[PDB]
Design a protein around this ligand. Sequence first.
Ligand code: WHL
Lengths: 11, 132
Amino acid sequence: PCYEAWVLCEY
Amino acid sequence: GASPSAQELKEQGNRLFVGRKYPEAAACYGRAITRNPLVAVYYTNRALCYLKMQQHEQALADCRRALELDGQSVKAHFFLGQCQLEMESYDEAIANLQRAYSLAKEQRLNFGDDIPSALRIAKKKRWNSIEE
Ligand SMILES: *CC(=O)Nc1ccc(NC(=O)C*)cc1
């Protein structure tokens, strides 16, 4: 998965 | 010097995470927790640092801390399930990934195809484990 996207998401 | 806010240390930890500086990121998230321990996302993000560092029990514990603060969190269930998958806790992992999917649907959020893909992968690994 796109762990970087998951980490940065403000949701 | 300056002591950042917790939000500022989260952002710093996020930057470190994107650079494969996993222990440094985890320490940053820890400093955010020291400033404000009531924010679930600091624990979820640190849990992924621990998973990247192969510290599975520490990752599980952070997921549990996050879920006590935000039981609706898609990310906390998703990361928990991904941790459990690596630990070969297949049935629990799949249930947590499925719960992440349902929460994302209920909350009308988009994470890509990441959750259905994770589910497919988890089921494959579980089936292979049984047959071998
Ligand atoms: C592949 C990809 O970009 N996935 C992805 C993950 C997470 C998010 N947003 C949040 O987690 C809040 C978007 C896309």
